[PDB]
Design an enzyme around this catalytic site. Structure first.
Site, PDB file in Angstrom:
ATOM      1  N   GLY B  13       0.864  -1.202   0.000  1.00 10.24           N
ATOM      2  CA  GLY B  13       0.000   0.000   0.000  1.00 10.24           C
ATOM      3  C   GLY B  13       0.890   1.237   0.000  1.00 10.24           C
ATOM      4  O   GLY B  13       2.134   1.136   0.038  1.00 10.24           O
ATOM      5  N   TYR B  15       1.318   3.434   2.298  1.00 10.91           N
ATOM      6  CA  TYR B  15       1.770   3.767   3.636  1.00 10.91           C
ATOM      7  C   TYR B  15       2.726   2.655   4.177  1.00 10.91           C
ATOM      8  O   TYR B  15       3.569   2.952   5.059  1.00 10.91           O
ATOM      9  CB  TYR B  15       0.575   3.950   4.567  1.00 10.91           C
ATOM     10  CG  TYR B  15      -0.611   4.695   3.965  1.00 10.91           C
ATOM     11  CD1 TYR B  15      -0.594   6.083   3.829  1.00 10.91           C
ATOM     12  CD2 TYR B  15      -1.733   3.996   3.481  1.00 10.91           C
ATOM     13  CE1 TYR B  15      -1.685   6.773   3.316  1.00 10.91           C
ATOM     14  CE2 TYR B  15      -2.798   4.661   2.897  1.00 10.91           C
ATOM     15  CZ  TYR B  15      -2.796   6.053   2.846  1.00 10.91           C
ATOM     16  OH  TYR B  15      -3.853   6.745   2.289  1.00 10.91           O
ATOM     17  N   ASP B 128      -9.714   8.715  -1.886  1.00 11.47           N
ATOM     18  CA  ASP B 128      -8.779   7.956  -2.699  1.00 11.47           C
ATOM     19  C   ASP B 128      -9.401   6.638  -3.189  1.00 11.47           C
ATOM     20  O   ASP B 128      -8.714   5.621  -3.368  1.00 11.47           O
ATOM     21  CB  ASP B 128      -7.515   7.676  -1.874  1.00 11.47           C
ATOM     22  CG  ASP B 128      -6.375   7.133  -2.734  1.00 11.47           C
ATOM     23  OD1 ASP B 128      -6.162   7.635  -3.871  1.00 11.47           O
ATOM     24  OD2 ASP B 128      -5.715   6.169  -2.277  1.00 11.47           O
TER      25      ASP B 128
HETATM   26  C1  FB8 Z   1      -4.030  -1.227   1.578  1.00 10.84           C
HETATM   27  C2  FB8 Z   1      -4.669  -2.205   2.495  1.00 10.84           C
HETATM   28  N1  FB8 Z   1      -4.657  -2.107   3.818  1.00 10.84           N
HETATM   29  C3  FB8 Z   1      -5.337  -3.206   4.277  1.00 10.84           C
HETATM   30  C4  FB8 Z   1      -5.772  -3.993   3.247  1.00 10.84           C
HETATM   31  C5  FB8 Z   1      -6.523  -5.248   3.336  1.00 10.84           C
HETATM   32  C6  FB8 Z   1      -7.425  -5.472   4.371  1.00 10.84           C
HETATM   33  C7  FB8 Z   1      -8.076  -6.689   4.396  1.00 10.84           C
HETATM   34  N2  FB8 Z   1      -7.858  -7.650   3.495  1.00 10.84           N
HETATM   35  C8  FB8 Z   1      -6.955  -7.372   2.520  1.00 10.84           C
HETATM   36  N3  FB8 Z   1      -6.757  -8.392   1.629  1.00 10.84           N
HETATM   37  C9  FB8 Z   1      -6.381  -8.388   0.263  1.00 10.84           C
HETATM   38  C10 FB8 Z   1      -6.503  -7.275  -0.581  1.00 10.84           C
HETATM   39  C11 FB8 Z   1      -6.122  -7.350  -1.908  1.00 10.84           C
HETATM   40  C12 FB8 Z   1      -5.625  -8.542  -2.408  1.00 10.84           C
HETATM   41  S1  FB8 Z   1      -5.132  -8.662  -4.101  1.00 10.84           S
HETATM   42  C13 FB8 Z   1      -3.572  -9.459  -4.055  1.00 10.84           C
HETATM   43  O1  FB8 Z   1      -6.063  -9.528  -4.754  1.00 10.84           O
HETATM   44  O2  FB8 Z   1      -4.944  -7.343  -4.630  1.00 10.84           O
HETATM   45  C14 FB8 Z   1      -5.519  -9.661  -1.597  1.00 10.84           C
HETATM   46  C15 FB8 Z   1      -5.888  -9.584  -0.271  1.00 10.84           C
HETATM   47  N4  FB8 Z   1      -6.267  -6.211   2.428  1.00 10.84           N
HETATM   48  N5  FB8 Z   1      -5.357  -3.343   2.069  1.00 10.84           N
HETATM   49  C16 FB8 Z   1      -5.562  -3.766   0.678  1.00 10.84           C
HETATM   50  C17 FB8 Z   1      -6.420  -2.779  -0.109  1.00 10.84           C
HETATM   51  C18 FB8 Z   1      -4.238  -4.095   0.003  1.00 10.84           C
END
Ligand code: FB8
EC number: 2.7.11.22
Lengths: 71, 284
Positions: B13, B15, B128
């Site tokens: 991400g 951050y 965002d």
């Molecule tokens: C920036 C951020 N902060 C917390 C999260 C976050 C919170 C809960 N679950 C997930 N799971 C997840 C997201 C995307 C993908 S993928 C490889 O298919 O892109 C795979 C698993 N992520 N996130 C996300 C938005 C990265």
């Protein structure tokens, strides 16, 4: 390298923007538009009569061009 | 904390780094966001840990619950419910020829608006918003991730951005999230981004070419904004339905109301939920 956009058009003008590398962008006037002589010195290559018509201040590396359609 | 075990990286991400992990006591699978905390000046208290604790108290089924917050060795860890897929990825799994199921588009937009209304009612913006921030479980529920993280810290991104911000308006508010939901609504329907620009300036010109070049007649005081020009190309308003497909007349009406130029006249989240488009809404 220098990238040339596809053309887009108005009712009156045809248009096209050109993206320079960021180290050349410090060489583009932050105060006035450019003569056809001036922009050719930066290596911009295109046909005659395109006019440098504006500056988007956040992106000084992007030269915006405009040419009148014939009538 | 010693209570969790990293399994594998899932991404980066803005951050910091994001891992998949398991709680050793419960066995629950979680997302863990590591953030290295910036050095701060003595005699200047930090809002950052304070603002992040506030976000822990936001609960709603269509936002990604911040389950906890740890601090070991000047590093901040944010712990969330793990969901394995996002909207960008879901759209990629649909093959050429196929489109997203008409009812599942409606369901997703409904859920997204529910979540944004919850945030907006509690005085919190995303700012965002984009397909990568919309996560999905296997059961067809959709949630906003990264709500309020922007304010807590900062001082593909471009496509979902609003014209207020692009033209350099001094201030902005809740309507920026509505514009973004607009452009995402169109993408759910078509599979492709509505305004696919290569730069800030090209992004504006693509918005202008579909909705008309704005002037003071359609958007009061726009000609006074920092990056407005009288020299922009001059396209006339109309022909939004030529840029989008698979939407009945209600869908097109709601979409057009999410993409109004003037922030003050643009539709709100509350109002959008009462729009006719949702009348015939379906199980899940
Ligand atoms: C920036 C951020 N902060 C917390 C999260 C976050 C919170 C809960 N679950 C997930 N799971 C997840 C997201 C995307 C993908 S993928 C490889 O298919 O892109 C795979 C698993 N992520 N996130 C996300 C938005 C990265």
């Amino acid at each position: 390298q220098i990238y040339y956009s596809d053309k887009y058009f108005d009712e009156h003008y045809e248009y096209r923007h050109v993206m320079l590398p960021r180290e050349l962008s410090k060489q583009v006037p932050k105060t006035h538009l450019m003569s056809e002589e001036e922009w050719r010195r930066l290596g911009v290559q295109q046909s005659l009569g395109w006019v440098h018509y504006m500056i988007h201040e956040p992106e000084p590396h992007i030269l915006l061009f405009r040419r009148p359609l014939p009538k | 904390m010693e209570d969790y075990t990293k399994i594998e990286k899932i991404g980066e991400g803005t951050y910091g780094v994001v891992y998949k992990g398991r709680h050793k006591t419960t066995g629950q699978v979680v997302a863990m966001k590591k953030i290295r905390l910036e050095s701060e000046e003595e005699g200047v208290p930090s809002t950052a840990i304070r603002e992040i604790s506030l976000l822990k108290e936001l609960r709603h089924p269509n936002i990604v619950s911040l389950q906890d917050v740890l601090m070991q060795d000047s590093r901040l860890y944010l712990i969330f419910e793990f969901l394995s897929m996002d909207l960008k990825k879901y759209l990629d799994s649909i093959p050429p020829g196929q489109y997203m199921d008409s009812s599942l588009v409606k369901s997703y937009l409904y859920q997204i608006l529910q979540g944004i209304v919850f945030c907006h009612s509690r005085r919190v913006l995303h700012r965002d918003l984009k397909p990568q921030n919309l996560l999905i479980d296997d059961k067809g529920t959709i949630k906003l991730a990264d709500f309020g993280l922007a304010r807590a810290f900062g001082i593909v991104t471009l496509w979902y951005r609003s014209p207020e911000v692009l033209l350099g308006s001094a201030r902005y508010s809740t309507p920026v999230d509505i514009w973004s939901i607009g452009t995402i609504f169109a993408e759910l329907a078509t599979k492709k981004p509505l305004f696919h620009g290569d730069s800030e300036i090209d992004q504006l010109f693509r918005i202008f070419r579909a909705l008309g070049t704005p002037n003071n007649e359609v958007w009061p005081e726009v000609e006074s904004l920092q990056d407005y020009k009288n020299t922009f190309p001059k396209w006339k308003p109309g022909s939004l339905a030529s840029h989008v497909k698979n939407l009945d007349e209600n869908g097109l009406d709601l979409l057009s109301k999410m993409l109004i130029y003037d922030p003050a006249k643009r539709i709100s989240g509350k109002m959008a939920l009462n729009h006719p488009y949702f009348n015939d809404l379906d199980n899940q």
